[PDB]
Write a protein that binds this ligand. Structure first.
Ligand code: HEM
Ligand code: HEM
Ligand code: HEM
Ligand code: HEM
Lengths: 146, 141, 141, 146
């Protein structure tokens, strides 16, 4: 996408104060409890019938950390998010068969967790800067499709 | 659908919000106008700035519709007739804008009360706002 | 929230389809598996190249399911009783796949009934399906 | 868009059978009818309050053909949709403020129209090839957004 020259700092700045590790485990876990139908892609993760079990399950954390790691090792490469998620979308389309609607759902989920985290410092203007980024990933990942 | 757990999760979460309801109904709107400009057209008459009598006057109102719903979860349709005909007839408020206003209200509640907002209250509050929305998106005809 | 109109058009349009309904359930699934391949993964035990006895059999079960809803317009939830639980908490069908199966069911009807597929009927059948969708995806919670 | 040699011959094989004057007016008319909220961005186009008034509204038919004429030109350049649609994007983005979602609804209503009028000649396969293109036009117009 096209963030400005000020929005570039709003994001880059607070990505440095968010423990992407925990966030990654909270976004993925928060998704699965909120959007139940996605548990179908993680059935080899064990049990996910109760909110607690899911937000405890060590697998979700280990993977969450992976989700947010690429989110970050993708940040800064903004103007070409299409070249950063290539194989990564191939994998999603051909291998996983995920529907891109779900990428907009996750970007939204992560975006709320962050709020729970930086609290008061996650002012409206920062939300609007992340809002465009998460759309950029969300649409980059939906690239190699049909 | 709002089940008993969902009903009691909402009430027990909204009850906590208390008097801030107004400041949080407005913040959300304000977050919406910024995060999604395409919604700013529905209001060419407000002063759409970081708070001007309008956004908080409006927020204050949005905060009350929800409190009404939150107090009538069992039967929203009746207790939401008006607004539904104000958005699905008079104003023709495009359906997908309720999806971007809910989000912001979730990012607003979550930034201010990060300790009641557990995964269940979240899941539960994503269904209130969903079934309130659907209700306000019936009248269409 | 179906006006009396939609209840009539839906009953007529479906009613004019008559015998053909089954054949439509199937056509609708091929057009889906090929238009939105992401949806083929719920049917790995099936063979779905073209007019294969399997899609042909599932298709009739699909048309019959709508024949009941069309006939129980007032109480849709009961009418579908188990199709919803069998969709939401079990196969765990993503909700977009309902959206893609409605437009490909609609497109079938048009290809076969351009005669009686006026804009009004088109709008009413669209609602009938969005309605049948919330049901199948309501027991998500 | 990623259109294979066969997929491509099918789509273009199909536009030659489409009467643009006719199609463009029935699609945009059905849009204003099936999804009421959409009428707003228009309004000025006169009396809209029944299938007959929108179908019969003259202006709905004219605009409906410019729309198709664009979809036509666009088709003549599947290889670089974004470029082609650039100018039209900030027209719907800045000028119109149309949620990009409506772009796919319209696309998906044009498909229901190609079917109502091409019947058997709109076999499952051809429609599939065409569903791609629709995404392409939607993502194309949803480019220069802000
Ligand atoms: C917001 C965008 C998302 C990002 C950045 C992302 C990224 C990733 C990454 C980093 C991997 C690495 C796998 C590899 O290359 O070996 C992965 C795997 C995977 N993703 Fe995502 N993902 C996203 C959204 C989703 C969503 C929402 C779903 C499904 C509902 C999903 C389901 C999966 C699954 C099942 C795997 C493989 C897990 C396994 O087999 O262990 N992803 N994803
Ligand atoms: C959580 C769901 C929503 C609730 C409950 C809500 C509530 C309300 C209320 C209470 C009014 C004021 C009625 C009065 O003055 O007596 C109203 C009007 C209005 N709403 Fe909403 N609203 C919702 C979503 C939306 C959305 C998403 C939009 C579009 C961005 C929207 C746009 C407006 C506009 C255009 C008016 C005009 C009111 C005026 O000019 O004073 N609302 N809404
Ligand atoms: C909205 C219309 C739909 C209706 C009314 C409906 C109805 C049906 C019917 C009648 C069956 C046969 C159930 C039985 O064994 O008795 C069924 C099962 C199932 N449905 Fe649907 N369904 C709909 C949409 C979908 C969608 C969107 C998907 C695809 C993503 C889907 C995937 C399946 C699968 C895999 C099965 C069972 C496989 C089998 O045992 O034959 N259905 N559905
Ligand atoms: C296939 C995608 C679309 C294409 C090819 C397209 C193209 C066109 C063209 C050529 C114009 C003239 C622009 C001008 O100079 O004013 C136009 C205007 C406009 N379009 Fe579309 N459009 C698309 C989808 C839609 C959708 C989904 C909406 C939603 C309601 C929309 C709303 C409008 C409005 C408000 C106008 C201006 C009214 C007027 O000029 O009288 N368009 N469109």
């Amino acid at each position: 996408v096209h963030l400005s020259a000020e929005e570039k700092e709003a994001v880059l700045g607070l990505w440095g104060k968010v423990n992407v590790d925990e966030v990654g485990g909270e976004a993925l876990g928060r998704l699965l409890v909120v959007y139940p139908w996605t548990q179908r892609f993680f059935e080899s993760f064990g049990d996910l019938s109760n909110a607690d079990a899911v937000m405890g399950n060590p697998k979700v954390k280990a993977h969450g950390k992976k989700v947010l790691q690429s989110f970050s090792d993708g940040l800064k490469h903004l103007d070409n998010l299409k070249g950063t998620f290539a194989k990564l979308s191939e994998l999603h389309c051909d291998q996983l068969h995920v529907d891109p609607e779900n990428f907009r759902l996750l970007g939204n989920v992560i975006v709320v967790v962050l709020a729970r985290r930086l609290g008061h410092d996650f002012n409206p203007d920062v939300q609007a800067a992340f809002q465009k980024v998460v759309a950029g990933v969300a649409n980059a990942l939906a690239h190699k499709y049909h | 659908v709002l089940s008993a757990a969902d009903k009691a999760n909402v009430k027990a979460a909204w009850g906590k919000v208390g008097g801030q309801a107004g400041a949080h109904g407005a913040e959300a709107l304000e977050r919406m106008f910024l995060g999604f400009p395409t919604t700013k057209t529905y209001f060419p008459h407000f002063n759409l700035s970081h708070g001007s009598d309008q956004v908080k006057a409006h927020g204050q109102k949005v905060a009350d519709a929800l409190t009404k719903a939150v107090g009538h979860l069992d039967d929203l349709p009746g207790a939401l007739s008006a607004l539904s005909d104000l958005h699905a007839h008079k104003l023709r408020v495009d359906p997908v804008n309720f999806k971007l206003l809910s989000h912001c209200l979730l990012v607003t509640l979550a930034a201010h009360h990060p300790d009641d907002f557990n995964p269940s209250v979240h899941a539960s509050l994503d269904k209130f706002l969903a079934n309130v929305s659907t209700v306000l998106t019936s009248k269409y005809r």
